[PDB]
């Protein structure tokens, strides 16, 4: 296991789907908020529906 800052790991994950890194870094807060809200929606979906 080789440590690596999570923002840079996500930069690699972006650069692996054909989107340059600067897209993430310039939109890091937007992407972080989108991810957090998505996880919240997952909680709601699992809690409401069996």
């Amino acid at each position: 296991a080789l440590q690596i800052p999570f923002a840079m790991q996500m930069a690699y994950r972006f650069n692996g789907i054909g989107v340059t890194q600067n897209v993430l870094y310039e939109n890091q807060k937007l992407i972080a908020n989108q991810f957090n809200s998505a996880i919240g929606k997952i909680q709601d979906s699992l809690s409401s529906t069996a």
Partner: protein, 57 residues
């Protein structure tokens, strides 16, 4: 362009992600996108131009 910026304490190199082979940072290792007010964690360093010495001499 491909790799990651690293530092051995004093100088900033750009290496490939999977094997430590440091290289001077020049404008052919790196590409410009944006400016310094938007990235979170951006540092100050000097990017060497391979063209300026040729023009100088």
């Amino acid at each position: 362009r491909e790799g990651v910026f690293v530092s051995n304490g004093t100088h900033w190199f750009v290496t490939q992600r999977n094997f430590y082979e440091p290289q001077i940072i020049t404008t052919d290792n790196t590409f410009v996108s944006g400016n310094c007010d938007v990235v979170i964690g951006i540092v100050n360093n000097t990017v060497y131009d391979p063209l300026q010495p040729e023009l100088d001499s």
